[PDB]
Amino acid sequence: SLALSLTADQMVSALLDAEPPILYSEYDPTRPFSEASMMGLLTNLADRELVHMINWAKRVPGFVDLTLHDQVHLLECAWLEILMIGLVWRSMEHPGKLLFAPNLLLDRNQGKCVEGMVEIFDMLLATSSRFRMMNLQGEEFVCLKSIILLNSGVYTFTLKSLEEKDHIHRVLDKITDTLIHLMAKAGLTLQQQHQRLAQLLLILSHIRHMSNKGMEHLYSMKCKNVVPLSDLLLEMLDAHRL
């Protein structure tokens, strides 16, 4: 595995290079918002982002060493967490707003347009605030996003099919090494390094919580026929079996 032979600097470079682009929404400022149109904009955007996410995952060191079925499982588990951490990152410099796209910046009041949404917006805004407090760095963000990809589904997959999992744990260990390397280079003390590492990883619990709530929300919008969802998005939603 080339993945396990990367230095910390090489891991950082690989992850930075693999970053997907920031997409635009179809937002038309002339069209008055409705519940349907807002869900339309957000789900249209998510659907286009999913295609780039799939191709990003292929470039995360270690990911394509996995069987296709294992790759499918990890993305099915993690896709909404990954969309969410990206959104929070884009929003870090816009206190009180969520930057879904450069032309779609929404505040909590606008979230009320959609039933049950404002509570999810509030959670996302709090995560953005936490990122700000910690002064999260870009190099740290890309490490966390790859950890989400590799970790979120790792406990829900024969003895032979058991050490597909060991490789994943080894790559996760390399990413931990990389995070610590970044912090040491930033001048943090050993104590500060382990403290910050824990602070960053604890945010992943909150991101999991938000994804679980968001998945239930999306399922509700589907059942209510609020808007049609793309085939890909329906498939990714159906994987959670709500």
């Binding site: 295609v51 292929k58 296709l68 499918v72 993305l75 085939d231 890909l232 498939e235 990714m236």
Partner: peptide, 9 residues
């Protein structure tokens, strides 16, 4: 699945 196919494309 679409995901499976795109992971192959």
């Amino acid at each position: 699945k679409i995901l499976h196919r795109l992971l192959q494309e």
